[PDB]
Design a protein around this ligand. Structure first.
Ligand SMILES: CCCCCCCCCCCCCCCCCC(=O)OC[C@H](COP(=O)([O-])OCC(O)COP(=O)([O-])OC[C@@H](COC(=O)CCCCCCCCCCCCCCCCC)OC(=O)CCCCCCCCCCCCCCCCC)OC(=O)CCCCCCCCCCCCCCCCC
Ligand SMILES: CCCCCCCCCCCCCCCCCC(=O)OC[C@H](COP(=O)([O-])OCC(O)COP(=O)([O-])OC[C@@H](COC(=O)CCCCCCCCCCCCCCCCC)OC(=O)CCCCCCCCCCCCCCCCC)OC(=O)CCCCCCCCCCCCCCCCC
Ligand SMILES: CCCCCCCCCCCCCCCCCC(=O)OC[C@H](COP(=O)([O-])OCC[N+](C)(C)C)OC(=O)CCCCCCCCCCCCCCCCC
Ligand SMILES: CCCCCCCCCCCCCCCCCC(=O)OC[C@H](COP(=O)(O)OCCN)OC(=O)CCCCCCCCCCCCCCCCC
Ligand SMILES: CCCCCCCCCCCCCCCCCC(=O)OC[C@H](COP(=O)(O)OCCN)OC(=O)CCCCCCCCCCCCCCCCC
Ligand SMILES: CCCCCCCCCCCCO[C@@H]1O[C@H](CO)[C@@H](O[C@H]2O[C@H](CO)[C@@H](O)[C@H](O)[C@H]2O)[C@H](O)[C@H]1O
Ligand SMILES: CCCCCCCCCCCCO[C@@H]1O[C@H](CO)[C@@H](O[C@H]2O[C@H](CO)[C@@H](O)[C@H](O)[C@H]2O)[C@H](O)[C@H]1O
Ligand SMILES: CCCCCCCCCCCCO[C@@H]1O[C@H](CO)[C@@H](O[C@H]2O[C@H](CO)[C@@H](O)[C@H](O)[C@H]2O)[C@H](O)[C@H]1O
Ligand SMILES: CCCCCCCCCCCCO[C@@H]1O[C@H](CO)[C@@H](O[C@H]2O[C@H](CO)[C@@H](O)[C@H](O)[C@H]2O)[C@H](O)[C@H]1O
Ligand SMILES: CCCCCCCCCCCCO[C@@H]1O[C@H](CO)[C@@H](O[C@H]2O[C@H](CO)[C@@H](O)[C@H](O)[C@H]2O)[C@H](O)[C@H]1O
Lengths: 102, 186, 167, 55, 101, 87, 79, 558, 101
């Protein structure tokens, strides 16, 4: 929320904070009490940028479905790491095809 | 017209008189100061050493031979310090709108409109970066309201002064137009 | 993925999934770091408008510019591809001599002035393209056009002359 | 008050000016217009206050 | 047996002139370094759009693959941010084991 | 989790201390280290350099209290001759 | 004391401090516009330490100034 | 201006080692603080909930500048205690304008005025108060977590050094050691509280935390439980620093151990700055919608501290026989009243808080001033009581027992009646000012539904009035064990004073006895002005209470 | 592995080997066979003034590696920070706190 990051700036979550401050100042005043309610989603996006709890929850689930799906299907021939270190190289076109399985 | 007369978000303060500058330059504050400010500043300044002298005559300190002379120089420095801070604060409150500034609005309008028609930047040009000019402005805005604690002055030519600048360009337009027809009709 | 520098990275995750057919395709640039720096000023001499449109476009769409600015990115890679093709077709001998120098000089331009000067004279004569560093001081010779380079590891020979476009 | 007014609205001008990626900073022209309205309304309110009472 | 090699007047004069010469050479050098830095920056600026464009297609590619991988596995896409902004991934789904090697 | 463990250690230094007034100086510093380490690790997690700045100022104030504290302990020792509590 | 204090403070911490069987992995990629002139952290702290947040430097300088004058006054014999 | 004064006084003090120059460094400190009053007096020309200054790390409010002025005036009154000699010699022949301004008096003033007393020989004493004052006026103006922490330590560290400044006192060194050690553990709680705020919010700015709290107050993966938990730990540190029960055990020991001149400053200024900062934090952390966030309000700890402070302060004080321990416990029961009005966040309670704080800071100052003057008046008195020869640090605290004030009515009636008027104000007896303060805090709580707490306050006010009355019984109900020194009036023991005109020519020579020695006017006038304010408040109440009605109207406005 | 790690281990190993020669070869013998005085306040002052000046000089190191950006505004603030710390030094010089003269 400071706007200055570790590498010479800016900070990763600073855009969400300015989006949150913009929402509050421009929709909430003393005339209308519930204007701030348009800020509830924007604050969650900023709490989520800092802590990444909801994203972690999506990945833990999606990763559990992915592993339980690729642990039961038939495997023909898994590519060795050396094959996937020659992928996209100018003289190893045979290995790129195997990696791409095309 | 640069098409962005108000370019920076600024704090509006509830005061009693029109705001001229949220952060005037030091040279302008001295320039717009009234002769009453000079008397008030000098009057306060002398009050510090004079209080120490009067306090010496009535309740004597019983110090040794050179102590009072050292104390008077320290009271004298604090007199000139406090006296100039009080004098500079009296002039700045009229730019801030916190004191009767009717004369100063007239001076400012003249100076800035005569800058506009001279092709000059309204507030001058900084050797500092646009971003450092922003940082400086965010430090000296309404700063003299804090002299009782910490001293700060503006020595940076930036264009973040809290005011929409259309009025300056509008009067320059109406003043060049007033003189153009007169020059061509006679 | 996150722009944080990694501290304990031991594994790489690749993804063989291609782009969807709907996105128009592009052939990516195949020049390495040193050839790109040799031709960096030539690419900015010709591609500057397209390079500036792309950055201006992404700016006009905050948080949504990776998508929503694809066509412009494809225009920058085609224009940069056209400059790399042209140096190869005409300036190949001097071009390789320059970036192979930068290979052994920490990729520092001041270390390879003689090769750049001969490449500058080939490009300017063949592609009319000139190297301009913007906002350089006016009271002194341009640093890239100076006979002597103080921070150069090896002295520049006096007979090696800086290329001035027209003399 | 259930509304907070920023004591320092100049925080909207904060942010490192170096190594800025394109499209990183959000567009805040609507913030600028809200604070412009507020300055113009106080200028006018005061102008009514000391011109309609000084005659 | 006084000798001029250790007399203060020649020493201060000699030390002073050395400092001025070095301060002349420091002034010129840092001015050259700051102009070498200007050419290095402009060189990386002319390359930043081509390099960012190839990165941007890669970010579009993986995101559209992850969005599809989910729709085929979990039956739908779980929204993380209420905004439509592209947020660069913090975590990723990974295979259970690395390549044999 | 390391930051909370060390904060307990400094706190338990006060729990287990009836005689050492030196160990209360030490336990205050362990608590300052845990809080600075927490700010520092959360700063890397949010890409914020302002946490590193706040950590720096906590180190300066922490040293300044060490100077002010060990000076007062010296003033106390000059007249008492022991730093021991008669318990 | 150990059970009560730990059982309360732990919940208070953010997710990223307690982020560390399927397991999450932290993915990172490269950027070019944000790498033009990367600064070391000290250079980044320096960029803001003496300008934007200079009031903290002023208050800390006075804290060190107090620890200097005050520690000497309580310990040394004058003259 | 406070920072220009510190550096200038520091440079002058650095190049001197003369201990006779202390008198004049304290006088220049009074003059320096008067310029700060004149600068902050001009900074009141706007109506604003607050303006952020210096990058948003500071703020100015009408309440901030009003209470910067109050802090500087309270400091000026305390500074007099080291700017003027305790006793003077006065004769009707040297009492006119021509005499006081144009003539001069010559006599051996050293033993009469205590020229070389311990208080008149610390060169850096005026300097270190300025350092404490600086941290006080920064706390009031802090808009950032970091600035709060740096300001609170600036104030705390200087208070520790004040308590240890009498280095030859084995009581002052102990008290400062106790204070630094229990004060440092308090600082960890304040630092833990701010650290836990930044880690859960990403922000150090109070306004961002206020807006995060504002949006959360609506009647999912990120429920903001941290703000009320973080502020709770953050409140424990400040509760200790104002000595609210149960975090109170240090104050009776520390206030009793350090010299009486010092405890005047130590026991007043810290509570002024801490209570102002808390008020703004309580206001913008309020719940306008009763939800689960309101069930864990941090303000409950202040409501429990107030209840505990009312009981402990009045009940434990019953069996105190040492006067500074008694006044320490009396302060605890007074912050139970201050804490009750802070916890009820209502327009009426906030006005009651501003009055209770100012009037009590002024009245507790009179109690310290009277005590210091009573000790400096026993110079012409002798005692054979055995319980007084066994006392410790009799110069740092001349009056340590309530037994020493037995029969003071006979020794000095109006000084005794001034202390009577002050003490009855602490009880809350009308028409005295201290009544109107407690009245406003009882009416605020009653109107908001804090009836159970109000009944507990009036019960402890009876209990606390017991030990207040015991001090009065000592001064007026018994004859004095203190008797006039026989030698100071022997009819052969006279000191020659000479009267000299401008050019050092002997106008007159007078023969003077111990009867021609009196209290210095700086202490007699100060006591007189505050006793009158406590007594005549019901005729001069409009502008004092109107200022508070306006300050609270701006804070709650909109 | 990293050079820093292998370097620290090698320095650690050399230290072990030099130690081993002493234990292995040097002769060994089984036989391995109360006052109070005030300490000088000077020892405290040496560490006190070092600790404070070491922190202040440390706080200036970020300025030296960020001077191109700090520029004139940064210079001013860093000079105000230098002046406050200097005034404290003149105080220890003035009171001979180091008790060296
Ligand atoms: C806590 C306690 C705090 C106490 C102190 C309070 C400080 C209040 C704020 C003052 C500092 C901030 C302002 C300076 C920063 C800045 O960028 O200035 C803009 C200024 C140029 O700004 P610009 O917008 O490009 O042009 C507008 C100028 O008015 C056009 O300027 P110009 O081209 O006409 O040049 C005139 C002048 C312009 O610079 C100034 O006037 C700034 C310095 C004013 C100091 C006033 C006394 C201290 C208050 O520069 C000079 O040539 C003189 C510089 C040195 C003066 C002598 C030393 C002064 C300090 C002595 C102690 O920068 C400089 O000129 C660089 C030199 C700055 C030196 C500052 C040194 C401060 C040291 C203090 C030690 C204690
Ligand atoms: C709510 C607030 C409402 C306020 C309403 C008004 C309240 C009543 C008015 C109070 C006036 C007090 C000042 C006048 C005074 O002391 O006159 C008696 C005093 C002589 O009568 P005395 O008590 O028989 O003198 C005994 C000896 O002089 C030997 O005396 P000493 O050596 O012990 O000390 C002499 C002098 C030492 O101080 C001075 O020399 C006073 C310097 C004041 C200006 C700086 O002491 C004082 O003046 C103490 C005044 C304390 C004022 C602050 C109280 C809070 O007058 C003087 O000679 C003082 C200088 C003449 C006045 C010049 C300044 C006038 C304006 C002062 C504003 C502050
Ligand atoms: C029982 C309490 C005992 C307290 C002892 C002090 C008694 C006074 C109690 C506080 C009253 C409020 C004091 C505020 C400061 C004084 C302001 C004032 O009276 O006049 C304002 C004036 C301000 O005047 P000015 O010079 O700034 O501008 C004048 C503006 N016009 C022209 C409109 C009048 O006095 C000052 O100069 C302020 C400096 C006061 C110096 C220190 C005063 C300490 C008291
Ligand atoms: C070494 C040998 C060469 C120098 C001495 C030569 C010599 O014989 O002395 C020449 C002259 C002294 O003259 P005189 O003593 O009369 O002897 C005349 C003999 N034909 O010598 C002189 O008068 C000149 C001596 C040298 C003057 C230049 C000094 C330059 C200093 C450069 C920076 C040095 C910084 C040192 C810092 C030290 C800090 C402690
Ligand atoms: C004991 C000795 C301590 C010395 C400390 C430093 C003293 C001042 C520094 C010495 C002067 C440095 C200098 O010589 O600057 C030379 C500079 C010429 O500019 P230059 O970098 O050579 O580029 C020219 C390209 N044609 O010329 C200039 O920059 C202009 C100088 C104008 C002001 C000169 C001083 C007044
Ligand atoms: C029990 C009391 C506890 C609190 C103690 C502190 C109370 C302080 C009260 C001060 C009130 C403000 O007092 C104010 O001073 C300023 C000083 O310039 C003056 O105010 C005036 O100043 C300028 C001139 O400089 C005018 O142009 C401006 O219109 C006006 O604000 C008035 O004299 C008074 O309005
Ligand atoms: C018993 C002790 C003696 C009485 C103690 C109280 C006396 C001083 C009370 C001063 C406070 C109320 O009095 C008033 O309040 C407002 C609050 O912003 C301030 O008023 C200030 O701002 C307003 C609004 O722009 C201006 O119109 C006014 O000229 C200016 O001085 C001043 O402070 C004072 O003019
Ligand atoms: C044997 C003696 C027993 C009683 C001794 C103590 C009682 C002394 C007098 C108590 C007076 C009764 O208490 C008083 O009643 C009125 C209404 O009736 C309350 O008025 C009301 O204020 C709030 C605010 O609207 C209401 O939500 C609430 O219904 C009610 O408390 C007062 O807040 C309360 O102060
Ligand atoms: C630091 C890395 C880990 C350690 C690596 C090296 C370990 C070396 C262990 C063996 C050291 C042998 O060293 C040898 O010890 C024996 C037993 O104490 C000594 O023996 C000595 O003491 C014994 C005690 O009973 C006597 O009886 C004997 O007469 C006397 O010589 C030898 O003089 C010494 O040379
Ligand atoms: C940017 C660098 C600036 C450097 C500034 C230099 C500081 C100048 C001010 C401090 C020096 C003047 O302050 C002076 O210090 C000297 C040395 O201790 C003292 O010297 C005297 O007292 C001390 C203590 O009794 C004796 O040990 C000493 O023998 C005696 O001469 C003076 O009493 C003091 O007045």
């Amino acid at each position: 929320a400071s706007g200055y990051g570790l590498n010479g700036g800016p900070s990763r979550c600073f855009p969400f904070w300015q989006e949150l401050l913009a929402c509050y100042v421009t929709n909430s005043s003393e005339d209308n009490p519930d204007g701030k309610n348009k800020c509830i989603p924007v604050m969650e996006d900023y709490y989520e940028c800092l802590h990444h709890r909801k994203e972690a929850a999506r990945v833990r689930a999606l990763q559990a479905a992915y592993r339980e799906a690729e642990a039961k299907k038939l495997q023909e021939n898994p590519p060795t790491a050396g094959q996937i270190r020659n992928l996209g190289l100018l003289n190893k076109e045979e290995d790129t095809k195997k990696v791409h399985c095309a | 017209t640069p098409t962005q007369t108000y370019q920076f978000p600024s704090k509006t303060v509830k005061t009693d008189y029109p705001l001229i500058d949220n952060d005037p330059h030091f040279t302008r504050v001295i320039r717009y100061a009234r002769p009453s400010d000079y008397a008030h500043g000098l009057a306060a300044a002398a009050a510090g050493p004079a209080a120490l002298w009067l306090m010496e005559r009535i309740s004597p300190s019983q110090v040794g031979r050179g102590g009072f002379a050292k104390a008077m120089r320290l009271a004298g420095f604090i007199g000139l310090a406090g006296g100039f801070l009080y004098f500079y604060q009296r002039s700045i409150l009229r730019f801030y709108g916190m004191s009767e500034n009717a004369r100063e609005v007239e001076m400012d309008m003249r100076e800035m409109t005569d800058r506009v028609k001279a092709g000059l930047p309204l507030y001058g040009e900084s050797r500092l970066s646009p971003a450092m000019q922003g940082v400086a402005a965010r430090q000296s805005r309404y700063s003299a309201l804090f002299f009782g604690v910490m001293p700060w002055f503006n020595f940076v030519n930036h264009n973040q002064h809290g005011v929409d600048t259309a009025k300056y360009y509008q009067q320059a337009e109406r003043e060049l137009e007033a003189e153009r027809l007169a020059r061509e009709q006679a | 993925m996150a722009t944080r520098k990694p501290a304990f990275n031991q594994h790489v995750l690749l993804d063989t999934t291609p782009l969807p057919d709907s996105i128009p395709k592009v052939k990516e640039i195949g020049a390495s770091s040193a050839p790109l720096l040799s031709a960096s000023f030539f690419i900015g001499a010709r591609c500057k408008d397209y390079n500036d449109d792309y950055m201006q476009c992404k700016n006009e769409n905050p948080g949504r510019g990776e998508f929503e600015c694809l066509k412009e990115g494809r225009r920058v890679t085609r224009c940069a591809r056209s400059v790399l093709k042209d140096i190869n077709t005409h300036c190949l001998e001097q071009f390789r001599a320059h970036w192979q120098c930068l290979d052994n000089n920490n990729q520092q331009l001041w270390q390879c002035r003689p090769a750049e000067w001969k490449l500058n004279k080939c490009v300017y004569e063949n592609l009319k393209l000139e190297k301009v560093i913007p906002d350089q001081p006016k009271n002194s010779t341009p640093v890239h056009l100076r006979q002597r380079q103080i921070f150069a590891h090896h002295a520049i020979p006096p007979w090696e002359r800086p290329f001035i476009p027209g003399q | 008050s259930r509304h907070i007014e920023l004591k320092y609205p100049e925080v909207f001008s904060h942010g490192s000016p170096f190594n800025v990626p394109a499209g990183f900073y959000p567009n805040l022209d609507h913030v600028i217009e809200h604070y412009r309205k507020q300055h113009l309304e106080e200028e006018e309110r005061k102008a009514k206050k000391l011109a309609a009472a000084a005659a | 047996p006084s000798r001029g090699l250790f007399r203060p007047r020649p020493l201060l004069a000699g030390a002073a002139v050395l400092m001025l010469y070095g301060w002349y050479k420091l002034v010129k050098g840092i001015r050259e370094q700051n102009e070498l830095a200007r050419e290095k920056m402009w060189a990386r600026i002319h390359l930043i759009p081509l390099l960012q464009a190839e990165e941007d297609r890669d970010h579009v590619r993986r995101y559209l693959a992850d969005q599809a991988r989910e729709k085929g596995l979990l039956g739908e896409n779980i929204k993380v941010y209420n905004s439509d902004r592209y947020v660069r991934p913090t975590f990723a789904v990974t295979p259970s084991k690395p390549a044999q090697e | 989790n390391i930051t909370l463990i060390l904060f307990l250690i400094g706190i338990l230094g006060f729990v287990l201390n009836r005689k050492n007034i030196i160990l209360m100086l030490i336990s205050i510093e362990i608590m300052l280290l845990s809080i600075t380490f927490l700010i520092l690790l959360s700063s890397l997690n949010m890409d914020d350099i302002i946490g590193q700045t706040y950590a720096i100022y906590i180190i300066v104030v922490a040293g300044a209290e060490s100077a002010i504290g060990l000076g007062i302990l010296v003033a106390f020792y000059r007249l008492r001759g022991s730093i021991a509590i008669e318990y | 004391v150990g059970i009560i204090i730990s059982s309360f403070l732990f919940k208070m911490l953010p997710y990223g401090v307690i982020i560390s069987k399927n397991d999450l992995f932290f993915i990172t990629s490269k950027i070019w516009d944000g790498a033009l002139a990367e600064n070391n952290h000290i250079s980044s702290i320096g960029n803001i330490m003496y300008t934007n947040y200079n009031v903290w430097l002023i208050l800390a300088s006075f804290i060190l100034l107090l620890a200097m004058v005050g520690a000497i006054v309580i310990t040394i014999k004058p003259r | 201006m406070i920072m220009i004064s510190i550096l200038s006084l520091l440079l002058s003090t650095s190049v001197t080692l003369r201990r006779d120059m202390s008198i004049l460094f304290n006088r220049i400190s009074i003059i320096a603080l008067a310029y700060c009053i004149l600068h902050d007096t001009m900074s009141l020309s706007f109506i604003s909930k607050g303006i952020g200054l210096h990058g948003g790390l500071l703020h100015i409010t009408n309440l901030t500048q009003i209470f910067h002025i109050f802090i500087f005036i309270i400091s000026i009154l305390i500074l007099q205690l080291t700017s003027f000699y305790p006793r003077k010699v006065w004769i009707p022949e040297y009492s006119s304008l021509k005499d006081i301004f144009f003539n001069k008096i010559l006599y051996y003033r050293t033993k009469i005025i205590n020229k070389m007393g311990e208080h008149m020989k610390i060169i850096e004493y005026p300097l270190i108060l300025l350092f404490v004052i600086s941290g006080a006026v920064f706390l009031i103006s802090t808009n950032d977590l970091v600035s709060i922490f740096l300001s609170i330590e600036l104030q705390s560290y200087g208070l520790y050094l004040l308590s240890t400044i009498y280095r030859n006192s084995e009581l002052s060194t102990t008290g400062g050691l106790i204070y630094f050690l229990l004060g440092g553990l308090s600082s960890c709680f304040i630092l833990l509280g701010t650290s836990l705020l930044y880690v859960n919010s990403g922000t150090t700015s109070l306004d961002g935390l206020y807006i995060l709290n504002s949006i959360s107050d609506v009647n999912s993966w990120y429920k903001p439980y941290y703000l009320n938990f973080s502020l709770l730990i953050f409140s424990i540190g400040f509760l200790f620093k104002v000595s609210a029960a149960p975090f109170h055990f240090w104050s009776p020991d520390v206030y009793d151990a350090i010299p009486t001149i010092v405890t005047t400053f130590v026991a007043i200024i810290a509570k002024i700055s801490i209570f102002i900062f808390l008020l703004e934090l309580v206001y913008y952390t309020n719940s306008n919608a009763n939800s689960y966030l309101s069930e864990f309000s941090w303000t409950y700890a202040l409501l429990i501290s107030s209840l505990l402070s009312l009981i402990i302060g009045t009940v434990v004080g019953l069996t105190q026989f040492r006067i500074k321990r008694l006044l320490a416990y009396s302060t605890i029961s007074h912050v139970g009243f201050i804490l009750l009005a802070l916890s009820v966040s209502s327009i009426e309670s906030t006005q009651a808080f501003i009055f209770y704080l100012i009037q009590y800071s002024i009245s507790n100052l009179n109690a310290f001033f009277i005590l210091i003057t009573i000790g400096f008046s026993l110079y012409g008195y002798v005692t054979n009581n055995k319980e007084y020869k066994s006392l410790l640090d009799k110069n740092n605290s001349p009056i340590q027992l309530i037994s020493q004030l037995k029969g003071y009515f006979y020794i000095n009636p109006l000084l005794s009646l001034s202390l009577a008027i002050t003490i009855f104000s602490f009880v809350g007896v009308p028409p005295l000012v201290g009544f109107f303060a407690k009245q406003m805090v009882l009416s605020a709580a009653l109107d908001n539904g804090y009836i159970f707490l109000s009944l507990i306050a009036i019960i402890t006010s009876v209990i606390g009035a017991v030990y207040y009355l015991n001090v009065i019984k000592e001064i007026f109900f018994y004859s004095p064990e203190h008797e006039v020194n026989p030698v100071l009036n022997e009819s052969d023991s006279n000191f020659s004073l000479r009267i000299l005109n401008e050019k050092n020519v002997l106008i007159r020579s007078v023969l003077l006895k111990g009867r021609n020695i009196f209290i210095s006017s700086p202490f007699s006038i100060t006591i007189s002005i505050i006793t009158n304010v406590i007594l005549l408040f019901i005729f001069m109440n409009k502008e004092w209470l109107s200022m508070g009605t306006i300050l609270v109207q701006i804070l709650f406005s909109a | 592995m990293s050079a820093m790690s292998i370097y620290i281990i090698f320095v650690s190993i050399i230290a072990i080997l030099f130690l081993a020669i002493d234990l292995i070869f040097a002769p060994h013998n089984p036989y391995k066979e109360q006052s109070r005085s005030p300490f000088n306040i000077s020892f405290f002052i040496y560490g006190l003034v070092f600790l404070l000046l070491d922190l202040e000089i440390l706080l200036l190191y970020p300025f030296a590696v960020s001077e191109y950006v700090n520029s004139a505004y940064g210079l001013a603030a860093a000079l105000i920070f230098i002046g406050i710390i200097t005034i404290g030094f003149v105080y220890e010089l003035g009171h001979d706190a180091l008790k060296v003269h």
